[PDB]
Amino acid sequence: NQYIVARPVYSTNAFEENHKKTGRHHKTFLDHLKVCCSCSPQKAKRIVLSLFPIASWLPAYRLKEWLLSDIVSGISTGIVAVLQGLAFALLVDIPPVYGLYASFFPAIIYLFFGTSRHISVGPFPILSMMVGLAVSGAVSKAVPLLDDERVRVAAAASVTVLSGIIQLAFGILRIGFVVIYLSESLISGFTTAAAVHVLVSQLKFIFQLTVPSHTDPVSIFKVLYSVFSQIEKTNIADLVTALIVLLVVSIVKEINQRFKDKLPVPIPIEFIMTVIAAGVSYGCDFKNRFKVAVVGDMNPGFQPPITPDVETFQNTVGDCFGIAMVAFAVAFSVASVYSLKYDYPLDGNQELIALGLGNIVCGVFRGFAGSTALSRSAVQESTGGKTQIAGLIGAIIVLIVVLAIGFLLAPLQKSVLAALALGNLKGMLMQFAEIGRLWRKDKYDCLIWIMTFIFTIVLGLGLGLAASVAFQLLTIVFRTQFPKCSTLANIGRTNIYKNKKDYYDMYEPEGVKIFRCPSPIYFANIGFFRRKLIDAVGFSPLRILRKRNKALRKIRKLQKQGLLQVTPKGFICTVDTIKDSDEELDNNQIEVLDQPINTTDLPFHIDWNDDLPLNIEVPKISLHSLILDFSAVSFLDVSSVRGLKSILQEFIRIKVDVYIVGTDDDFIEKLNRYEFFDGEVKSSIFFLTIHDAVLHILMKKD
């Protein structure tokens, strides 16, 4: 293995001169506007087919290989949807039939507009809690039992419609890339804090206590206080039933995971528990005997369309944005796992449109907002679901319950529903281990997990999320705030330059400094960069320039007085031991000491690093060349270029050659727009590599 190279030393300009470029186009935004104005029938076709995905997947359905799978998966998911709809309607604090509406409408809409083939569309616990909190606030801000339920049901429907409107708007504006602004640490911390929120929310049903409609901030603490202050009023029958169901479901749930091979089909413990709980409750007349809360009678059939309330929209708009983003983020994440697994394209923009339309329709018909539940989606997929036909079948199961078999669920205890929801919390609850994992791998990510968790707990799920996204953006600045700048040296007398402090027997060419900032330089960075560069070269170039300008002034003074006489050969100290009086420039004249030194007046050059006439003294510097390794400087901003231009001008005015190496062509293209180059800062300072600049410097000094 030999790395052997023989080429010219290349400055970036010299390289462009010797190597012809290719034609480039600006791709004017007007051109983008031009392309948008296509109207080609094929484009129209693709667009409509993009907006109505069912017209493409339905016709290509493999009936023989997919129908039975979707039918079986649909029945399974349909049952889960019914029970989860009831439970999550409890979480919204409205009658449980509206959870059935929330499990029905969004899914039917998704069948026509969704691009995912595996998610089960409907409510999930975090969004139901967020909707319930939005409702409590809306009601509290409304200028003046069943009546209270009516108001909550109306506020929930309005919140749902506004969330769907926001989602649909974001999908029409093609901003489905917003999910990228959420890191995995943020999602982990947020979902752990949200699992704690859900746990606390189920306590009023486990104990059967009456808890006020608390709002954020610190609603979780407010609820905990409400639950524990009145803990003696707890219904024992509710608690025991909840404990038994929770204990049994968890034991059986683990068995399914451990013994997947041994089992022909997983035991459906959650379904078995509800049927048994409902049967026993009905059989032993638990509602009368132990005064247990039960699901109760639900009137069959759907509600008539409700008009969204504009007053509610004004009151809850901030909440709705949080609800819309959370709904989209969760759905997209769940969908992504499946699309990747099954190798099909998932369109983020279409998902926003589909989820948004589903929500608007659901809200109008009195259901609450939901996108997808990870547990329900897993069931649809694990039971063999192939397409969104499984989702349609599931919706039909929900419809049957809503229209004909709703009465069967009447004797089911609320605590049992709450206990099932608690069982699903374990996956999310196990995310506490991530803090330790993150701590070893990356402190910034660990900080993000912790801040997100704290923000989600103290402020609510919605406000906490906004604060968490802001803090996670701030950590990007934390990462690049104090870059580990370095001085580089040559290793092995070849073209390799590394940290001057890392290896033995390194070599700096005499009078050359090579400085590296391993980060992009911008507003939060450039002062630190200047401090580190001045520490690396060992002096401040502006201080040196000011001391030289002062000396030049004294020299000119003595020259005019006569004590000093100019000469082709240096200077004449006509008068020895001369006077010692400083000019003491005023506040309005001191700026002259910062101007480029011009000594043309004097015929000869003043070597500023050699002795000066008449004891005049100025710090001497050995630096004649400064190389800035800009390979890791990704971008620059106006502050960095202003600061940069400033630093470079100062080095150049003190006769030190400056070289910027390791940048690409886009970089110099960008730097040309900033009006960076002029006289006394030229594009000649850019070289290809550190070794190009070093060899150029050595030839100059030769």
Ligand X SMILES: NC(=O)n1c(O)c(C(=O)c2cccs2)c2cc(Cl)ccc21
Ligand Y SMILES: CCCCCCCCCCCCCCCCCCOC[C@@H](O)COP(=O)(O)OCC[N+](C)(C)C
Q: Which is nearer to ligand X, 334 or 551 (CB)?
A: 334
300 binds, among Cl ion, ligand Y, a second copy, none (CB under 5 to 8 A by kind): none
DSSP category for residue 177: G
| Amino acid making up residue 596 | P
Residues from 23 through 62 that contact ligand X (CB under 6 A): none
Q: Are 548 and 597 in contact (CB under 8 A)?
A: yes
Q: Are 223 and 201 in contact (CB under 8 A)?
A: yes
- 268 touches ligand Y by CB under 6 A: yes
374 binds, among a second copy, Cl ion, ligand X, none (CB under 5 to 8 A by kind): Cl ion
Q: How far apart are CA 403 and CA 300, in angstroms?
A: 5
Region near ligand X per CB under 6 A, out of 78-86, 319-327, 482-490, 669-677: 78-86
Q: How far apart are CA 686 and CA 694, in angstroms?
A: 12
Instruction: Identify which of 47, 326, 302, 22 has the alpha carbon closest to the alpha carbon of residue 157.
Output: 302
- 9 touches a second copy by CB under 8 A: yes
- 674 touches ligand Y by CB under 6 A: no
Task: Retrieve residue 245's tokens.
Answer: 């169901």
**Alpha helices, DSSP H, located in 284-347:** 286-290, 310-342
Q: Which is nearer to ligand X, 80 or 648 (CB)?
A: 80
Q: Which is nearer to a second copy, 287 or 550 (CB)?
A: 550
* Residue in the block written with tokens 């999930």: 124
Q: Which is nearer to ligand Y, 70 or 309 (CB)?
A: 70
Q: Which is nearer to Cl ion, 428 or 644 (CB)?
A: 428
Out of 217, 268, 296, 384, point to the residue binding a second copy (CB under 8 A). Answer: 384
- How many chain residues are in contact with a second copy, going by CB under 8 A? 100
Q: How far apart are CA 150 and CA 163, in angstroms?
A: 20
- 377 touches ligand Y by CB under 6 A: no
Out of 82, 374, 544, 612, point to the residue binding Cl ion (CB under 5 A). Answer: 374
Instruction: Identify which of 202, 188, 190 has the alpha carbon closest to the alpha carbon of residue 462.
Output: 190
Out of 70, 270, 309, 629, point to the residue binding ligand X (CB under 6 A). Answer: 270
Per DSSP, the residues of 419-476 read HHHHHHHHHHHGGGGHHHHHHHH-HHHHHHHHHHHHHHHHS-HHHHHHHHHHHHHHHH
76 binds, among a second copy, Cl ion, ligand Y, none (CB under 5 to 8 A by kind): ligand Y
- 379 touches ligand X by CB under 6 A: yes
Q: Which is nearer to Cl ion, 69 or 375 (CB)?
A: 375
- 373 touches ligand Y by CB under 6 A: no
Region near ligand X per CB under 6 A, out of 80-88, 206-214, 495-503, 668-676: 80-88
- 415 touches ligand X by CB under 6 A: no
Q: Which is nearer to a second copy, 271 or 478 (CB)?
A: 478
Residues from 543 through 602 that contact a second copy (CB under 8 A): 543, 546, 584, 586-588, 590-591
- Kind of pairing between the strands at 686-687 and 657-661: parallel
- 379 touches ligand Y by CB under 6 A: yes
Residues from 619 through 648 that contact a second copy (CB under 8 A): 631-635, 637-639, 641-642
Q: Which is nearer to ligand X, 80 or 628 (CB)?
A: 80
Smallest distance, Cl ion to C-beta of residue 697, A: 48
Q: Which is nearer to ligand Y, 382 or 595 (CB)?
A: 382
315 binds, among ligand X, Cl ion, ligand Y, none (CB under 5 to 8 A by kind): none
Q: Compute the radius of gyration of the chain from its Cα atoms.
A: 36
Region near a second copy per CB under 8 A, out of 90-98, 455-463, 600-608, 685-693: 685-693
- How many chain residues are in contact with ligand X, going by CB under 6 A? 14
Query: Measured between alpha carbons, how far is residue 113 from residues 109, 320, 328, 521 in Å?
Result: 6, 22, 15, 45
- 1 touches a second copy by CB under 8 A: yes
Query: Measured between alpha carbons, how far is residue 585 from residues 96, 578, 589, 594, 599 in Å?
Result: 84, 20, 6, 13, 20
Out of 15, 57, 66, 271, point to the residue binding ligand X (CB under 6 A). Answer: 271
Q: Which is nearer to Cl ion, 375 or 631 (CB)?
A: 375
- With residue 276 as reference, give the H or E element that holds it: helix 269-283
- 479 touches a second copy by CB under 8 A: yes
427 binds, among Cl ion, ligand Y, ligand X, none (CB under 5 to 8 A by kind): ligand Y
Task: Retrieve residue 621's tokens.
Answer: 């510097």
146 binds, among a second copy, ligand X, ligand Y, none (CB under 5 to 8 A by kind): none
Task: Retrieve residue 13's tokens.
Answer: 């300009």
Phi-psi group of 663: left, alpha or beta (phi > 0 → left; psi -120 to 50 → alpha; rest → beta) = beta
Q: Which is nearer to ligand X, 274 or 349 (CB)?
A: 274
- 382 touches ligand Y by CB under 6 A: yes
373 binds, among ligand Y, a second copy, Cl ion, none (CB under 5 to 8 A by kind): Cl ion
| Amino acid making up residue 230 | Q
Q: How far apart are CA 368 and CA 327, in angstroms?
A: 12
Region near a second copy per CB under 8 A, out of 3-11, 202-210, 220-228, 561-569: 3-11
| Sign of the CA dihedral running 389, 394, 395, 396 | positive
Per DSSP, the residues of 523-538 read TTTHHHHHHHHHHHHS
Smallest distance, a second copy to C-beta of residue 541, A: 12
Q: Which is nearer to ligand X, 40 or 587 (CB)?
A: 587
DSSP category for residue 372: B
Q: How far apart are CA 44 and CA 32, in angstroms?
A: 17
268 binds, among Cl ion, ligand Y, a second copy, none (CB under 5 to 8 A by kind): ligand Y
- 271 touches ligand Y by CB under 6 A: yes
Query: Measured between alpha carbons, how far is residue 300 from residues 122, 401, 431 in Å?
Result: 20, 8, 41
Residues 6+ apart with CB under 8 A from 122: 81, 84, 85, 102, 103, 106, 107, 370, 372, 373, 376
- 8 touches a second copy by CB under 8 A: yes
Instruction: Identify which of 293, 301, 248, 234 has the alpha carbon closest to the alpha carbon of residue 411.
Output: 293
- With residue 67 as reference, give the H or E element that holds it: helix 63-92
Instruction: Point out which residues pair with 678 in neighbouring strands.
Output: 681
420 binds, among ligand Y, ligand X, Cl ion, none (CB under 5 to 8 A by kind): ligand X
Out of 53, 73, 79, 381, point to the residue binding ligand X (CB under 6 A). Answer: 79
- 384 touches ligand X by CB under 6 A: no
- 355 touches ligand Y by CB under 6 A: no
Per DSSP, the residues of 538-577 read SS-HHHHHHHHHHHHHHHHHHHHHSSSEE-SSSEE--SSS
- How many chain residues are in contact with Cl ion, going by CB under 5 A? 3
46 binds, among ligand X, Cl ion, a second copy, none (CB under 5 to 8 A by kind): none
**Residue numbers at the binding site for ligand X (CB under 6 A):** 79-80, 83-84, 87, 268, 270-271, 375, 379, 417, 420-421, 424
- Which residues sit at the interface with ligand Y, rule CB under 6 A? 76, 79-80, 253, 256, 266, 268, 271, 375, 378-379, 382-383, 424, 427
